[PDB]
Amino acid sequence: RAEVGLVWAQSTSGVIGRGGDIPWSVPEDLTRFKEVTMGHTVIMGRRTWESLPAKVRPLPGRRNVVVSRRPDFVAEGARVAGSLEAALAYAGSDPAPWVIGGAQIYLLALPHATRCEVTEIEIDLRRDDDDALAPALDDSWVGETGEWLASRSGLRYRFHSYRR
Ligand SMILES: NC(=O)C1=CN([C@@H]2O[C@H](COP(=O)(O)OP(=O)(O)OC[C@H]3O[C@@H](n4cnc5c(N)ncnc54)[C@H](OP(=O)(O)O)[C@@H]3O)[C@@H](O)[C@H]2O)C=CC1
Numbered sequence: 001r002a003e004v005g006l007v008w009a010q011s012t013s014g015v016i017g018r019g020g021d022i023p024w025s026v027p028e029d030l031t032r033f034k035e036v037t038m039g040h041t042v043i044m045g046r047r048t049w050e051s052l053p054a055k056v057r058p059l060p061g062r063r064n065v066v067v068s069r070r071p072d073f074v075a076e077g078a079r080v081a082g083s084l085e086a087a088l089a090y091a092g093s094d095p096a097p098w099v100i101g102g103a104q105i106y107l108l109a110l111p112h113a114t115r116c117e118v119t120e121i122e123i124d125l126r127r128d129d130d131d132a133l134a135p136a137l138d139d140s141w142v143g144e145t146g147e148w149l150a151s152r153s154g155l156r157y158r159f160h161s162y163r164r
């Protein structure tokens with residue numbers, strides 16, 4: 001009944017995070033992310049929660065769920081869950097909960113997911129051993145890809161939407 005989605009931005013090289021942060025600024029991607037997730041449950045790993053800017057934590061108008069192995073973790077204004085299955089239970093009757101990162105939580109959620117919304121960013125980031133990486137999609141997914149677009153930031157980006 002519920003369609004579980006994943007939403008992320010990556011470099012063409014597959015990087016989603018570096019130094020505990022996102023290593024670009026593409027406002028158009030932030031706009032997309034906001035539009036995808038407004039009004040829905042958003043599920044995220046503990047590190048992603050801690051990486052959010054304090055002026056958007058918890059994310060407004062969304063039910064925030066934070067996944068940790070530590071049931072005692074305190075996340076003000078969010079629900080803490082000990083597994084993806086527990087996180088999805090907190091979504092309740094939300095028809096389209098979203099998993100919003102990071103690398104570890106995407107891999108946990110991927111086998112439950114039926115939708116992925118991906119932003120690809122043309123930025124010269126050579127992937128390093130400590131980088132947080134995007135999940136790889138297999139042949140079960142079918143996608144449509146939008147045109148490359150020029151950002152007001154100067155970078156080129158494009159949107160992909162995958163379903164199965
Ligand atoms: N470009 C993008 O679209 C986005 C990028 N980011 C970036 O990604 C990075 C964060 O990713 P990552 O470091 O992988 O961290 P995650 O956000 O995936 O958080 C990982 C944490 O999740 C919990 N966890 C992992 N596996 C399990 C499990 N099996 N059961 C219960 N809890 C589990 C643990 O919390 P605990 O240690 O408390 O037990 C672990 O430390 C940052 O750089 C961030 O900026 C984040 C979101 C989107």
Ligand SMILES: CCOc1ccc(OCC)c(NCc2cnc3nc(N)nc(N)c3c2C)c1
Nearest residue numbers: 007008009029030033034053056059100101119
């Ligand atoms: C509702 C506002 O959300 C955010 C605002 C600003 C932010 O950082 C500023 C440096 C945010 N950071 C996390 C974040 C940023 N961009 C993203 N882009 C995409 N496409 N998907 C995400 N999951 C995703 C996430 C989780 C999220």
